[PDB]
Enzyme design. Structure first.
Site, PDB file in Angstrom:
ATOM      1  N   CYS A  92      30.654 -15.146 -30.848  1.00  0.00           N
ATOM      2  CA  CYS A  92      30.015 -13.861 -30.477  1.00  0.00           C
ATOM      3  C   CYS A  92      29.226 -13.317 -31.645  1.00  0.00           C
ATOM      4  CB  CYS A  92      31.162 -12.838 -30.068  1.00  0.00           C
ATOM      5  SG  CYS A  92      30.547 -11.142 -29.724  1.00  0.00           S
ATOM      6  N   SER A 138      29.438 -10.428 -32.828  1.00  0.00           N
ATOM      7  CA  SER A 138      30.300  -9.657 -33.742  1.00  0.00           C
ATOM      8  C   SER A 138      30.976 -10.504 -34.825  1.00  0.00           C
ATOM      9  CB  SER A 138      31.397  -8.884 -32.986  1.00  0.00           C
ATOM     10  OG  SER A 138      30.848  -7.825 -32.219  1.00  0.00           O
ATOM     11  N   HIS A 170      28.462 -10.663 -37.429  1.00  0.00           N
ATOM     12  CA  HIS A 170      28.381  -9.386 -38.143  1.00  0.00           C
ATOM     13  C   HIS A 170      29.385  -9.333 -39.322  1.00  0.00           C
ATOM     14  CE1 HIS A 170      25.571  -7.770 -35.300  1.00  0.00           C
ATOM     15  NE2 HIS A 170      26.436  -7.105 -34.483  1.00  0.00           N
ATOM     16  N   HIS A 224      37.522 -13.668 -32.180  1.00  0.00           N
ATOM     17  CA  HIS A 224      38.158 -12.674 -31.314  1.00  0.00           C
ATOM     18  C   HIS A 224      38.004 -12.919 -29.766  1.00  0.00           C
ATOM     19  CE1 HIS A 224      34.069 -11.289 -31.634  1.00  0.00           C
ATOM     20  NE2 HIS A 224      34.247 -10.559 -30.518  1.00  0.00           N
ATOM     21  N   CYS A 264      36.000 -11.332 -24.459  1.00  0.00           N
ATOM     22  CA  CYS A 264      35.076 -10.363 -25.068  1.00  0.00           C
ATOM     23  C   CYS A 264      33.769 -10.222 -24.257  1.00  0.00           C
ATOM     24  CB  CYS A 264      34.772 -10.603 -26.526  1.00  0.00           C
ATOM     25  SG  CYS A 264      33.807  -9.183 -27.090  1.00  0.00           S
TER      26      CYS A 264
HETATM   27  N1  LIG Z   1      30.993  -2.626 -27.576  1.00  0.00           N
HETATM   28  C1  LIG Z   1      31.742  -3.729 -27.589  1.00  0.00           C
HETATM   29  O1  LIG Z   1      32.931  -3.746 -27.216  1.00  0.00           O
HETATM   30  C2  LIG Z   1      31.184  -5.073 -28.029  1.00  0.00           C
HETATM   31  C3  LIG Z   1      31.740  -6.313 -27.531  1.00  0.00           C
HETATM   32  C4  LIG Z   1      30.808  -7.408 -27.539  1.00  0.00           C
HETATM   33  C5  LIG Z   1      29.737  -7.506 -28.472  1.00  0.00           C
HETATM   34  N2  LIG Z   1      29.342  -6.324 -29.112  1.00  0.00           N
HETATM   35  C6  LIG Z   1      28.006  -6.264 -29.700  1.00  0.00           C
HETATM   36  O2  LIG Z   1      27.025  -6.476 -28.634  1.00  0.00           O
HETATM   37  C7  LIG Z   1      25.833  -6.967 -29.246  1.00  0.00           C
HETATM   38  C8  LIG Z   1      25.238  -8.181 -28.494  1.00  0.00           C
HETATM   39  O3  LIG Z   1      26.157  -9.278 -28.698  1.00  0.00           O
HETATM   40  P1  LIG Z   1      25.639 -10.761 -28.225  1.00  0.00           P
HETATM   41  O4  LIG Z   1      26.726 -11.707 -28.567  1.00  0.00           O
HETATM   42  O5  LIG Z   1      25.127 -10.712 -26.812  1.00  0.00           O
HETATM   43  O6  LIG Z   1      24.422 -10.935 -29.239  1.00  0.00           O
HETATM   44  P2  LIG Z   1      23.067 -11.819 -29.311  1.00  0.00           P
HETATM   45  O7  LIG Z   1      22.606 -11.789 -30.658  1.00  0.00           O
HETATM   46  O8  LIG Z   1      23.277 -13.139 -28.585  1.00  0.00           O
HETATM   47  O9  LIG Z   1      22.030 -10.998 -28.350  1.00  0.00           O
HETATM   48  C9  LIG Z   1      21.264  -9.965 -28.864  1.00  0.00           C
HETATM   49  C10 LIG Z   1      19.801 -10.063 -28.329  1.00  0.00           C
HETATM   50  O10 LIG Z   1      19.036  -8.968 -28.875  1.00  0.00           O
HETATM   51  C11 LIG Z   1      17.677  -9.443 -29.079  1.00  0.00           C
HETATM   52  N3  LIG Z   1      17.032  -8.530 -30.012  1.00  0.00           N
HETATM   53  C12 LIG Z   1      17.176  -8.475 -31.388  1.00  0.00           C
HETATM   54  N4  LIG Z   1      16.411  -7.487 -31.938  1.00  0.00           N
HETATM   55  C13 LIG Z   1      15.778  -6.935 -30.902  1.00  0.00           C
HETATM   56  C14 LIG Z   1      14.816  -5.859 -30.816  1.00  0.00           C
HETATM   57  N5  LIG Z   1      14.383  -5.189 -31.909  1.00  0.00           N
HETATM   58  N6  LIG Z   1      14.402  -5.535 -29.597  1.00  0.00           N
HETATM   59  C15 LIG Z   1      14.780  -6.184 -28.492  1.00  0.00           C
HETATM   60  N7  LIG Z   1      15.657  -7.239 -28.481  1.00  0.00           N
HETATM   61  C16 LIG Z   1      16.151  -7.592 -29.642  1.00  0.00           C
HETATM   62  C17 LIG Z   1      17.891 -10.878 -29.541  1.00  0.00           C
HETATM   63  O11 LIG Z   1      16.643 -11.637 -29.479  1.00  0.00           O
HETATM   64  C18 LIG Z   1      19.072 -11.382 -28.734  1.00  0.00           C
HETATM   65  O12 LIG Z   1      18.654 -12.146 -27.612  1.00  0.00           O
HETATM   66  C19 LIG Z   1      26.120  -7.199 -30.728  1.00  0.00           C
HETATM   67  O13 LIG Z   1      25.746  -6.117 -31.595  1.00  0.00           O
HETATM   68  C20 LIG Z   1      27.638  -7.319 -30.717  1.00  0.00           C
HETATM   69  O14 LIG Z   1      28.188  -7.041 -32.028  1.00  0.00           O
HETATM   70  C21 LIG Z   1      29.965  -5.127 -28.702  1.00  0.00           C
END
Ligand SMILES: NC(=O)c1ccc[n+]([C@@H]2O[C@H](COP(=O)([O-])OP(=O)(O)OC[C@H]3O[C@@H](n4cnc5c(N)ncnc54)[C@H](O)[C@@H]3O)[C@@H](O)[C@H]2O)c1
Ligand SMILES: NC(=O)c1ccc[n+]([C@@H]2O[C@H](COP(=O)([O-])OP(=O)(O)OC[C@H]3O[C@@H](n4cnc5c(N)ncnc54)[C@H](O)[C@@H]3O)[C@@H](O)[C@H]2O)c1
EC number: 1.1.1.1
Lengths: 374, 374
Positions: free
Chosen positions: A46, A48, A51, A67, A174
């Site tokens: 993921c 995160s 991160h 996780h 997740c």
């Molecule tokens: N709230 C929660 O409980 C929780 C749980 C899951 C993941 N997270 C967070 O969710 C987010 C997404 O996770 P993921 O695994 O899908 O990530 P990922 O990196 O696969 O997807 C993120 C997408 O955002 C795009 N992106 C980047 N900058 C951009 C911009 N300026 N404008 C538009 N698009 C843009 C990327 O090209 C990518 O496709 C992360 O920040 C992660 O840490 C949160």
């Protein structure tokens, strides 16, 4: 038999930010009272977890990250009542103690026993179950799934269907549950509505699945990587836009496209500027915007409160709003009955030993979820 | 007899910022198609009127301000169907056209014909009905109640009970409805909850009335003027706190008092810092914060989005979320049936000619609502 004994196994240890993981031998202590030791079967990569490497999400180092996973119980500590050796299980990065004010609240899910708000990198008792090179190693969100074996508190594990395919249902730990719940539970998307989804990775695709499930008429995907658009449309997007193709700010573009603003918007990236854009593209009097992305540590955003005074609702959530231990087994049962799909999220499969290649795939843009098998 | 003719009458003109109102003769044109000319009977002094004087709230000058009022229809233009000469009416500073996407939405009230988002200070047709010393004068929020006579568009007036006491029900035109609705409609305060109300003027007192009617168990008033506390307790506050009495930030104090955060908080002042404090003091997983105060022109707040990611909800509203033309007559009827009280809000009653004395009573801290009588 290994019950009551230290296990030596391989794990992916992160000794320093901005470095590859080190695959090497660790020592995993046996479980104490109300603890569960798990043989891992599959774990997803993921954003995160990335991160933690980049210092976006601060947690003590050195650490065993991971996780989003599934495995099989190896042994249980004194007093455990909710799982047994041989059960299939999903670790819960958000615990469910059942006793705090949040667990007792109908809508609350961010249990006060979590290790996210002020991460300590320990078990609930303030100690570690891991040693490497003779040195203590921190846990991550009470889970630490980048290891052949981990130890978790009982409030951080759920029993699942014995027939479950662990190489798929790992994503219920997740990314799937987070995105799906953000749409159907947190936002409560309505039939016939217009939605905008910022970020088309595994979590944003899962938000699209939830918006389609709720009957949205229009689902607008937003990403600066146009290679993400084809899969977004396969799972329900009606249209996709790349902000880099426009001369105007994408909030203005999206307001025009939706004839005055969208009903529901979602930030699924983790950037300050797209959290404010996503707010502003929802209709000013009745729109709702949900923050899902994890922000850069300790950084504040700037916004005009008139965006709220007109009538907008702004909210965020962890794990799609789901009470973790109640919800995970029911989500697995729903998957077994074909109520949603996980295959669209799985683009790559690798052995655990090739973890670093899996992180390279995520960083380059080419993957959604890579699943690692032990 | 005045129908069809220009009326010469007394009004309070604001020629420039940070000056007293000028009480002098104006000329009021007759109503055009779909317009209504009203003889004013009573008008309240609200802090939003003062924000025009201070430059907090930008609108074109010179202006006739005033937006919280009640009067009697003197004449109607061609095509009006919803009021007649002789009717008691309240001016609606938020219109209800009935035809835009916001009016058709079940939960929207901020009609797209409003003059608050981008003030122009005219009638709907882009012209003014007021002159003074031969100069055109602006309208304010399509109401302009600080005049013996005003002209409003039909979508910005509601007919009310012929028997109602105008010197009281003037408050339903803004401060009562806004505070009460913010609690019962926008926040949806629940039975047994803990609430915190920042700012104990006429609007915050009306928030307290709404929290008490909704069955809250605890209602904590917050104000830097301790002289406001006795009346806040009379209308339902269980305790009051002055931030200046404490060494620690008041969000920390309120979190401790509520054993981990309040269920509902309200910002009823208009300051960036108290908007962020109010959000922070609500419980991190399930708390709700509502912004009611009007912010300083063009200024942005700074906040950490982790306050939202954990699960808080942040919203704002205009006019308590009430659809204006539908709601105002029902609220008057509810007052006539003794469902709520207005007298606790009224501390001073003065003739219209004493408008500047009324504003100095507000500014010094000594009044809640002054009612001005024509
Ligand atoms: N709230 C929660 O409980 C929780 C749980 C899951 C993941 N997270 C967070 O969710 C987010 C997404 O996770 P993921 O695994 O899908 O990530 P990922 O990196 O696969 O997807 C993120 C997408 O955002 C795009 N992106 C980047 N900058 C951009 C911009 N300026 N404008 C538009 N698009 C843009 C990327 O090209 C990518 O496709 C992360 O920040 C992660 O840490 C949160
Ligand atoms: N949203 C709407 O539709 C709407 C409608 C009504 C009025 N308004 C706004 O609501 C707000 C309240 O209006 P009112 O007429 O009740 O005003 P008011 O001035 O009578 O009351 C505000 C109170 O805030 C207190 N206060 C000021 N600074 C403070 C601080 N730093 N900390 C704590 N308390 C503080 C004052 O002592 C005062 O009692 C104003 O900003 C007004 O413009 C909004």
């Amino acid at each position: 038999s290994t019950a009551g004994k230290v296990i030596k196994c391989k794990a992916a240890v992160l000794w320093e930010e901005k470095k590859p993981f080190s695959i090497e031998e660790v020592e995993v202590a046996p479980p104490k009272a109300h603890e569960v030791r798990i043989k891992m079967v599959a774990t997803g990569i993921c954003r995160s977890d990335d991160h933690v490497v980049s210092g976006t999400l601060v947690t003590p180092l050195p650490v065993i990250a991971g996780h989003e996973a599934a495995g099989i119980v190896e042994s249980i500590g004194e007093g455990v009542t909710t799982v047994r050796p041989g059960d299939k299980v999903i670790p819960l990065f958000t615990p469910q103690c059942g006793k705090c004010r949040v667990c007792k609240h109908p809508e609350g899910n961010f249990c006060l026993k979590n290790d996210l708000s002020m991460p300590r990198g320990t078990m609930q008792d303030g100690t570690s179950r891991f040693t490497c090179r003779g040195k203590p190693i921190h846990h991550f969100l009470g889970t630490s799934t980048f290891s052949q074996y981990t130890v978790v508190d009982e409030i951080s594990v759920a029993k699942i269907d014995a027939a479950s395919p662990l190489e798929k249902v790992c994503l219920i730990g997740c990314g799937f549950s987070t995105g799906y719940g953000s749409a159907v539970k947190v936002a409560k998307v309505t039939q016939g509505s217009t939605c905008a989804v910022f970020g088309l990775g595994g979590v944003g695709l899962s938000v699209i699945m939830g918006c389609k499930a709720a009957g949205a008429a229009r689902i607008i995907g937003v990403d600066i990587n146009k290679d993400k658009f084809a899969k977004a449309k396969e799972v329900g997007a009606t249209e996709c836009v790349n902000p880099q193709d426009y001369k105007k700010p994408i909030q203005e573009v999206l307001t025009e496209m939706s004839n005055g603003g969208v009903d529901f918007s979602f930030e699924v990236i983790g950037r300050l500027d797209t959290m404010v854009t996503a707010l502003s593209c929802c209709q000013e009097a009745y729109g709702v915007s949900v923050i899902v992305g994890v922000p850069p540590d300790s950084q504040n955003l700037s916004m005009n409160p008139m965006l709220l005074l007109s009538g907008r609702t702004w909210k965020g959530a962890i794990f799609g709003g789901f009470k973790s231990k109640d919800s995970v087994p029911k989500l697995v049962a729903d998957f077994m009955a074909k109520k949603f799909a996980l295959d669209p999220l799985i683009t790559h499969v690798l052995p655990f030993e090739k973890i670093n290649e899996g992180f390279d795939l995520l960083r380059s843009g080419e993957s959604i979820r890579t699943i690692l098998t032990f």
